[PDB]
Amino acid sequence: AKVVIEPHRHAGVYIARGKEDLLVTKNMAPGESVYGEKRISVEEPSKEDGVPPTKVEYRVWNPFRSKLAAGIMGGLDELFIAPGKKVLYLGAASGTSVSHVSDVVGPEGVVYAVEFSHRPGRELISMAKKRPNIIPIIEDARHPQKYRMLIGMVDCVFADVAQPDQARIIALNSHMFLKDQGGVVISIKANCIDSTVDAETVFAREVQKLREERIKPLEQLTLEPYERDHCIVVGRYMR
Amino acid sequence: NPKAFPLADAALTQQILDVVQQAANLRQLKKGANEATKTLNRGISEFIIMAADCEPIEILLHLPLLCEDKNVPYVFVPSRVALGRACGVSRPVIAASITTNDASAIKTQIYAVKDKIETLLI
Amino acid sequence: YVLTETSAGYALLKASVLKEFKIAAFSKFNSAANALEEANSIIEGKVSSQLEKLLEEIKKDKKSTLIVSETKLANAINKLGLNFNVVSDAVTLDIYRAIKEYLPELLPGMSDNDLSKMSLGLAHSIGRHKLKFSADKVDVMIIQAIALLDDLDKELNTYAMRCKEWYGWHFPELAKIVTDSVAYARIILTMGIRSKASETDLSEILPEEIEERVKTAAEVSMGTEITQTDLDNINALAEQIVEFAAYREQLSNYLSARMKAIAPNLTQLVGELVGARLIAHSGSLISLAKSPASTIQILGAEKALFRALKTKHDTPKYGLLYHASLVGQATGKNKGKIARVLAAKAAVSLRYDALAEDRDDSGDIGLESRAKVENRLSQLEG
RNA sequence: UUGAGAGAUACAAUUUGGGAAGAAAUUCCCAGAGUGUGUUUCUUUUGCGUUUAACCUGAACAGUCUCAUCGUGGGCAUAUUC
RNA sequence: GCGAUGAUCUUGACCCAUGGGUGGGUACAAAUGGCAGUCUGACAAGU
Numbered sequence: 076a077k078v079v080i081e082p083h084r085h086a087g088v089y090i091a092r093g094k095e096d097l098l099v100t101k102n103m104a105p106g107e108s109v110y111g112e113k114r115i116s117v118e119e120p121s122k123e124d125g126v127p128p129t130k131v132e133y134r135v136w137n138p139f140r141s142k143l144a145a146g147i148m149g150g151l152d153e154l155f156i157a158p159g160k161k162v163l164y165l166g167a168a169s170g171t172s173v174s175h176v177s178d179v180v181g182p183e184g185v186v187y188a189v190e191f192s193h194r195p196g197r198e199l200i201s202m203a204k205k206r207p208n209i210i211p212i213i214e215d216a217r218h219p220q221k222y223r224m225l226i227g228m229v230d231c232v233f234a235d236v237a238q239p240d241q242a243r244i245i246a247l248n249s250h251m252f253l254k255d256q257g258g259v260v261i262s263i264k265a266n267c268i269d270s271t272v273d274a275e276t277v278f279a280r281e282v283q284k285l286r287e288e289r290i291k292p293l294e295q296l297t298l299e300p301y302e303r304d305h306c307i308v309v310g311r312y313m314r
Numbered sequence: 315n316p317k318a319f320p321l322a323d324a325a326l327t328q329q330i331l332d333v334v335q336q337a338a339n340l341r342q343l344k345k346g347a348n349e350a351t352k353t354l355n356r357g358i359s360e361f362i363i364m365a366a367d368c369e370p371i372e373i374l375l376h377l378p379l380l381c382e383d384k385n386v387p388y389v390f391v392p393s394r395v396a397l398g399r400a401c402g403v404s405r406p407v408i409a410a411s412i413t414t415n416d417a418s419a420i421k422t423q424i425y426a427v428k429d430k431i432e433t434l435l436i
Numbered sequence: 437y438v439l440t441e442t443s444a445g446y447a448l449l450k451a452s453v454l455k456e457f458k459i460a461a462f463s464k465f466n467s468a469a470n471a472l473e474e475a476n477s478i479i480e481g482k483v484s485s486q487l488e489k490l491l492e493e494i495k496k497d498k499k500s501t502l503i504v505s506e507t508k509l510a511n512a513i514n515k516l517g518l519n520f521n522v523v524s525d526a527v528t529l530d531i532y533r534a535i536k537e538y539l540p541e542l543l544p545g546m547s548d549n550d551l552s553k554m555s556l557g558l559a560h561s562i563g564r565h566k567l568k569f570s571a572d573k574v575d576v577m578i579i580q581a582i583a584l585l586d587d588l589d590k591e592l593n594t595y596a597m598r599c600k601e602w603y604g605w606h607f608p609e610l611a612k613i614v615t616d617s618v619a620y621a622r623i624i625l626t627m628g629i630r631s632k633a634s635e636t637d638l639s640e641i642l643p644e645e646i647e648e649r650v651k652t653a654a655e656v657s658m659g660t661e662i663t664q665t666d667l668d669n670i671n672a673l674a675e676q677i678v679e680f681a682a683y684r685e686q687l688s689n690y691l692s693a694r695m696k697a698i699a700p701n702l703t704q705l706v707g708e709l710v711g712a713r714l715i716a717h718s719g720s721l722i723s724l725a726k727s728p729a730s731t732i733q734i735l736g737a738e739k740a741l742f743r744a745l746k747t748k749h750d751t752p753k754y755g756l757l758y759h760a761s762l763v764g765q766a767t768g769k770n771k772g773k774i775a776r777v778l779a780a781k782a783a784v785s786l787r788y789d790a791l792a793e794d795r796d797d798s799g800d801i802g803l804e805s806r807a808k809v810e811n812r813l814s815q816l817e818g
Numbered sequence: 819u820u821g822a823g824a825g826a827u828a829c830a831a832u833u834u835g836g837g838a839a840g841a842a843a844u845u846c847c848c849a850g851a852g853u854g855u856g857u858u859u860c861u862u863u864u865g866c867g868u869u870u871a872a873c874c875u876g877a878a879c880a881g882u883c884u885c886a887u888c889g890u891g892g893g894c895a896u897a898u899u900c
Numbered sequence: 901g902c903g904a905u906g907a908u909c910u911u912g913a914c915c916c917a918u919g920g921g922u923g924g925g926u927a928c929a930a931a932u933g934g935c936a937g938u939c940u941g942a943c944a945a946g947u
Contacts, residue, residue: 213567
């Protein structure tokens with residue numbers, strides 16, 4: 076028989092049950108192969124005239140590739156990613172995890188892919204010629220006043236970098252394009268900062284700098300072993 | 315060549331040529347970038363040593379891409395003749411691969427040099 | 437007091453500190469070249485046309501104390517002859533943040549739709565501009581064209597044999613003499629009926645010792661004779677066969693300059709169709725040049741090779757490289773070694789044209805590779 | 819190691835916050851904190867590294883010739899071994 | 901104002917209290933459909 080796919084505890088993030096346990100989003104530009112992935116064609120059977128009822132395609136989405144999926148599977152109650160919002164996706168580095176953000180953000184949402192490297196941007200524009208919601212910028216991510224003309228503003232911000240100066244790097248963006256009570260979602264990798272030392276001191280000084288730049292982390296946790304020595308940090312700006 | 319990164323200093327270069335030379339004793343070496351590419355596909359390589367002054371450089375650049383795909387460390391070393399001369403061949407080698415054994419007698423030096431390379435990549 | 441930066445106009449805010457969340461002035465730019473050079477203007481810190489216009493029009497009541505966002509924009513407006521005092525403190529400002537919150541409310545006829553579409557169309561333009569190539573890195577069209585060429589030849593000998601089946605009623609004795617499709621179509625397209633045997637229409641098509649056989653065939657052939665309407669459909673059909681015959685020539689001439697466009701050194705090594713079919717059967721260029729040369733030397737005949745790997749026999753030693761003239765120039769023992777050498781250099785030329793420098797440089801370095809192959813072939817013939 | 823400070827775990831008892839039932843007493847379903855006894859982790863006290871403590875290297879000591887590989891023929895046990 | 905110049909009768913298959921669902925052929929597109937893991941890897945030629 077066929078599976079049933081029900082929505083999870085955030086809208087736009089759907090879960091497949093039960094002989095398959097897959098975390099799926101809403102496809103809106105079909106025929107693709109981001110990595111040669113499958114697609115799931117589902118519908119609700121109704122009795123209507125005209126056309127048969129619509130098979131709203133859902134595409135699978137792994138925690139082994141994106142930290143945001145593993146943050147959903149690891150346990151969460153509140154999130155700033157929902158259908159319709161505007162997100163600033165800091166760092167993409169291939170353009171593969173962008174399309175799942177463009178799926179889950181809905182058609183109303185606009186995903187701004189940030190990149191400063193010449194090689195992966197050729198796949199960013201490859202994804203951008205496929206889907207009508209993805210705006211790529213090949214811009215310096217350190218200088219917000221050098222891409223202010225291109226972008227408008229976003230509703231929340233995502234930090235995929237794990238750099239030792241990133242407490243400045245999001246700050247120049249958080250002072251610039253994010254509203255009050257805006258959402259800040261960070262994915263800090265512990266061994267990408269420094270590897271001679273335990274992770275708890277690094278996480279403590281990073282959440283200290285989050286308190287310094289007026290970020291209020293409502294929940295911070297290590298994920299669970301879908302990644303190794305990693306944290307995703309959820310905080311609100313000017314709460 | 316600005317493409318040659320991460321490029322090494324003197325003492326680490328001497329240590330890496332030494333460890334390569336001892337592995338070249340124990341029949342535990344792969345030579346030529348073609349064979350090293352096959353080891354990176356088959357997933358048997360500890361790491362990859364690539365000569366930085368390889369002219370033209372176009373023949374080499376895919377190996378670090380596939381390295382960071384499979385999360386396998388790598389180091390550029392600034393001269394090819396010391397590399398292939400440290401492999402026991404009287405012709406230049408530009409890229410070579412070290413294989414994996416859970417009972418090889420040179421294991422600790424392999425792990426220490428790997429720790430140096432993971433320090434270089436971060 | 438405030439210069440507004442956006443790619444749809446340059447707006448001075450005095451709302452005409454004393455502010456009222458309105459506009460004092462705005463001076464508009466909106467086109468491809470306007471937004472592209474403004475996009476270069478914010479990155480360069482460059483003084484734009486409408487910026488100097490906004491310094492020229494309003495003055496002495498809103499521009500004596502101007503706050504610019506970029507500190508590079510403090511120097512050029514500082515040295516303006518209109519004698520202005522330019523500071524740049526509190527650029528990060530709730531009012532400056534609150535400019536874009538009312539930007540569809542301050543620009544008449546603009547909303548949140550046209551800013552995003554022009555922002556996307558500008559992001560594609562500056563994205564093609566910075567990466568100095570196209571948005572897709574066009575290589576797929578070779579994969580399309582070499583998929584079309586074989587089907588073109590299939591329609592060609594299809595309709596040629598159809599014409600032979602048709603015209604065999606009037607004149608059956610021709611196919612045993614002339615067997616080529618194109619010369620079969622040209623003869624019927626010139627002659628008409630077999631009673632109209634003329635010499636020059638033989639001379640432009642065939643060699644003479646075949647032509648006399650076609651003439652003596654034109655005597656003794658006593659096939660059926662029929663009205664002119666059939667002859668009209670036949671010469672129409674033969675015009676279509678010569679038409680397609682020129683058409684696939686134009687398609688291969690399209691594949692010529694595209695193959696010399698993308699991979700010049702591969703083209704100098706193995707011509708067009710060889711590396712063309714290798715790029716095709718691979719799937720792309722960049723997935724092909726990342727491969728070992730051993731997989732290159734046997735890419736093609738996957739199934740006989742893998743069958744030999746299952747049953748532990750001799751693995752066959754020719755992939756798709758069995759058709760280039762170098763491989764076809766050796767004999768049974770010299771041949772496979774030239775093939776191994778051939779992939780051993782062909783991987784180098786794939787990585788030549790692969791990694792984004794030889795594409796701009798149009799190729800001079802497969803020429804050495806041909807010398808190294810030829811000199812090995814010379815000593816491998818003694 | 820014996821001292822000195824902290825941490826992890828289980829069993830018994832104790833105690834409480836939420837979801838369902840009952841006037842209450844009491845029961846059903848999640849969550850937490852206390853008391854003892856066991857198991858046990860980390861800093862710190864002290865002995866020790868005399869550095870002939872270990873490892874690597876050009877090694878007369880692979881010479882009564884050595885080693886690998888495919889065969890062959892016997893002994894014992896019931897991916898073999900001699 | 902009927903037919904051996906075919907009249908008659910049957911080979912779409914089933915089930916249920918117009919309606920409903922399977923069954924098979926054709927064309928189209930895609931496959932966590934088929935590659936233990938897409939060849940071996942250091943000497944040969946001459947004197």
